[model samples]
Target: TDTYLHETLVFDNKLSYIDNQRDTDGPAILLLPGWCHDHRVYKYLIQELDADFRVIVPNWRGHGLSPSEVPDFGYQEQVKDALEILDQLGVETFLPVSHSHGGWVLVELLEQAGPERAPRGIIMDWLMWAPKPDFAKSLTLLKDPERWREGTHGLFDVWLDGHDEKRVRHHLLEEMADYGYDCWGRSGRVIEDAYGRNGSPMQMMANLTKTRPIRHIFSQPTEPEYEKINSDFAEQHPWFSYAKLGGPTHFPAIDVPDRAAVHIREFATAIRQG
Candidate 1:
């Protein structure tokens, strides 16, 4: 186990996070986990980066160790919670590395913080069209709230698919159980509603690229639909750059932390130098 400190902060809602302050003298990086996951999802990635950066991994509003009491909150409120956490830490600027639904939160943060505050963002395997009503409608769980909770355990299995390493698989299952059922249910509903109600997030992403640098990292054996959308967007926007990992699942950081860390380090370095 790593020697990071566990701390909790009371924002609009209580938030729990892992703070690896070993390299506080270096730049800060905020690692946001995907849906149904907490900060522990980035355990290996944190180990890789903690030597060179101050890494702060916080649980989402109603996920992990964070307060699950807030029954109603969306991406906007989640972004607000993130901003408050940053303010409390006195971190005026930092690089954001987000995965899956966490990428949407990063988008909102970029829009809210603007160029001066949020210089660059690294998005990993984010479904660019998820917020569009059309895509949201395809999610069957949204139509049935009861099934949403019951089905999440299976979802966890899918997330662990390509992670064949026994230790990695075991750790993930333990973490999944630790996150519990309600956290996933509540977080899933809010995420579905947010994406279901809002228009495409591409517009905001395009706007952000105009000012700050953005990198989209895709996992290998990519989904055709996700690749088509991401590739199309990358081709259209000069500011956006896309790359792929080698034989990793949706959660690349967890499945292949060393590989993921290299890409993250390169992107952060490029942004810092420019």
Candidate 2:
């Protein structure tokens, strides 16, 4: 709160964003946070990248500073919002950083926009490909108006299991109190579009990453099938890579900002030169 600049923009729905201007001419990044989380969630990470990147953290329509709920807003809608935000800020190109559910928006952005716009991406702790049965089960409950409460609570439990940062937890649950279930239901349904409209998540990634490269940073280890599937796919496509982190927290940006910054800065540097 004290370090980050909390700001809002009017675009039909009130969208909240944080802009860190410390990086004068370095990489400009657009940060897409997870469901039920916001720009505040990236506190430490934002500060860590302060010296090297001009970053924007936008809370979706219903979360964080943007308390006005857009009835059917979803990933595609967020893509539009994201592009509009960059246009409004005059950022022609940027590197995208996706955390958890934010990957849905990043996926569509990659599919809809060309590589020149989003050349390289960094994904943190998201089930990008090879979702298990439990993944579908979680969404099933989350999409249901009545059942979304249980689904959302259970998710935060797991997400907050290992890490016990008071501030991050406070903000995350605060959003839950302030229309979190709605975001849950919408995200549950919209996330399907990440894979449903496209082919399998891997295939979609394969198709999209043919030109641009993407890197996945994970704190929690992935499932066997996900590892098996991605291992094979990534072996063939150097454009895609997933590197495990030392800390086991799902929200690496919040819990392990230093490590996250190292990986991100390295990737940005590689892509910038490559």
Candidate 3:
């Protein structure tokens, strides 16, 4: 009940955001959702954290009430969007609590914006390297929008299992649409526009050596993949930590919001007390 949720346009895309104010002095934490996810998914966690630290939740472009323009929605651009959000709200310093693809975007943001802007970052159920880097399964969705829509239903049904129908529909139509087959196509456009230049992904991990106080909360299969590629990336890196969560698919914030909230409190408190 103490949380405030609002929507704003950044880079001409509507962004749905939520904030919980703390009367006492403490660090502010930004809760960044995964790709094509809405802020409501973290409502439970936000409510739990509202009592202590101030929490800000932002929906990515094209999700929630945000504008679904589908422009240059790649890593760099997404990170850019995040920085702009901080600037828009006048956030001086904060830790990034990023989920799923949000973790990837936060890394990219740190790479582009630098650690001076924000010193800490956390990853939950994230993917450092793309799961199926090629997005082979995603390509199937791009076969055709109509076919994509039909196939997507099955995808959602499987993902949701037995969630409420109306909520699932709202999520798919509102948030999921932003990252549909079309968004993938637009991302390719972003890559093509780079023209042999380094895409954001490469720069994201490479720049981590310079950043500080980074942590990762990885799910099972996904963490193994990150470990496989960068076995010592976190260990060798001076500023990285890792954690795991149970009873969640890729979106633990939504799957087990209460547990996720506890992690946020612990992480935020560590930084504030340190």
Candidate 4:
């Protein structure tokens, strides 16, 4: 009955992760879930490929089992932890799959820092764009000590607006349950700044020379002009790639793990990362 051995280990940097391995000696995949969420976000997706590939799912500090008293964890710190974990595990190369803000982390830091180790990446439900005025307002509310819960809850409310997928809803509902108000506020603030003043992050990602191959799987319908804007954006950049799975949800991996796995599998197997 025990097909896979799931090891919950803590790296010296205090990054906690699920090292799920079975009989598979295949290429390793680094799975990064977003801010406010943990490795469980990629739980189902891991199962889909557990028999064929080993997955390393790490929890952002202060989220899930990776708790921290320190404050203001930013892009560079996370990227450092991710890179260190791979090297510590003796993984020469890995194909990374990130969700939401995790995608931002991958694009902003990891992809550029470790191009050889990370040849290609799979991002789900992260539409790389500037945060609108309304999104800014939500960020403000989330930053407020008194209203952070309401603001954070409201954001998830809108995120889980459509598509009544049971498991994803549960996953999203419990996503914020682990961390404290400080983490919630701080995480939102970082995300707000990234999507706010950063302009289009995808463009930043495209500028990188080393890590060329990327597959962005999006299901969030937040952008009303989604199809047109992103389709053109991806096409214009020869290296950037994307796929829009029809859904009004942001938890594409949880919503459709089987389908998500298909895309990840294709991308991981398509090119060999040297």
Candidate 5:
């Protein structure tokens, strides 16, 4: 039986989603896509998972079929939209698995909901919080007229290997080309302000140590400095665990869907049992 159901919901704006309702016997899980991508990015991973968990994937406002012109496209607004969606679905508590920008929104959700409401999270290849001095500066480059004019195709290229180029070109590249630059600028501004106020994104994550258990899965080829920060955080916080994907690009769920699905399934099950 086909278990996929594509639907839309009206919240701050119209948001589209894909729900795999094959099995509600296990805990509910939310899959959050990164910038320039939509809920469809998880199609491969979703196919690999067992028919025992309910998976919900939503396209953030201003992305996918959602409203293209969100007045405020910051992390806070994204979190609000996600919360409203979950509430409308009658989901009191659920696990969040997010990537890149989506991981940033997941942290905000954790900060707002606390551990009681957000039990655990699985962050895949999100390094905006790593203690890299130039992280914010890199994001700022996206807003530069000259740089933006030059092109941002390389960003999407890194995520696509020879096997998935055609599909990703249409699914991610074309869609991102439409409004990705503006979205990056808006999201970057929010991160810059948050980092300035909190001293660093690492500090923000530290503050949320009391929230709930979080497992961070980084790409295998991450920089040394990024790995150091991730390792240090795990050492400091007993509730935090860190691992690396096997030769994955920026998009592990797409690069290695089977392995990614295994990791997500095992982590969520462990958290559920605890």
Candidate 6:
């Protein structure tokens, strides 16, 4: 028999997703997508978590099935949307598995909910707490307006190596261009203000030391410059249990779902058993 996934409305514009709901007695877990991403990227992680948990994945505003029409698409709003979803589920406790910008959103959720209602644990990969180095001076398209005009864009291609060109192109226009580019502009600004100003991101990360257990995972890009700072930041957090996956950029869930699935399940199980 096939499985069914239910989408529960949290806010009028957002949703709380419960996928493969056969196991209600299992732990309840929430999976959050990165910037400009939807619940689909964690498809493999959901399958793994569903084995031991009733997984709930949310489409942060402007990302997936959730409303993207809001004027502001910054980090704080993302956190609010997540909290709203948790409340709607009537979830007293659950674990959060977040990636990239979603990790930051989770932190913001913890801060708002307070330690009592905080998640059991957090499994985060390539978590973005700080601004990228050289972003201010970056001549790259993502950072430079003039250079951005000449840059090509694409969606979150999970099957990176074997993805069909036609599908990639279609996703590029429909999802990547429509959601990602604008989200990067808005959320990147918040990241820059907090992290880039004077390394406030480091301070914000230090604040997490006061909270629940956090499992930090990082995907190492070939570029040394890109991977170094993220590695250092993950290490600085004593509460963070860090791991590195080779040959992937920041988005391991998209690049290597099979391997990423192992990490997500291991972390979820560890949290659930405790």
Per-residue accuracy of model 2 over 158-190 as CA lDDT, tens digit each: 667656767557755774466656677778877
TM-score of each: 0.84, 0.87, 0.74, 0.88, 0.84, 0.73
For model 6 the local lDDT of residue 198 reads: 32
- Report the C-alpha lDDT of model 3 over 1-274, residue by residue, as the tens digit: 3238776788777776786545555457788876545676676667677777777787666666434555545656677777777788777667778865566667766666666656677677644443253343543553555565565555565455455645445556665665565554453344333323443333455556565776666544433555654456655766666666645354566556677776767766776666
RMSD of each: 3.2, 2.6, 4.5, 2.8, 3.2, 4.6
- Residue range with the least summed lDDT across 10 consecutive positions in model 6: 150-159
* Cα-based RMSD of candidate 2: 2.6
lDDT of 5 at 20: 64
Candidate 6 lDDT, 199-257, residue by residue in tens: 65345556764566666665643457745665575566556555667633445665556
Better of 4 and 6 by lDDT: 4
Worst 10 residues of 3 by lDDT: 193-202
True-structure lDDT of candidate 3 = 0.61
Off by over 4 Å in 4: 1-13, 22-26, 65-68, 109-112, 222-224
Local accuracy of candidate 4 as per-residue lDDT tens digits, 146-214: 998888777777777756778877876665565767677887778876765556677667656564777
Task: Give the residue spans of candidate 5 off by over 4 A.
Answer: 1-9, 65-67, 128-137, 149-151, 157-172
- Candidate 6 residues lying further than 4 Å off, grouped into runs, are 1-18, 65-67, 127-177, 180-182, 196-202, 223-237
lDDT of each: 0.69, 0.73, 0.61, 0.72, 0.69, 0.57
Candidates by lDDT, descending order: 2, 4, 5, 1, 3, 6
User: Residue pairs in steric clash, candidate 2?
Assistant: none
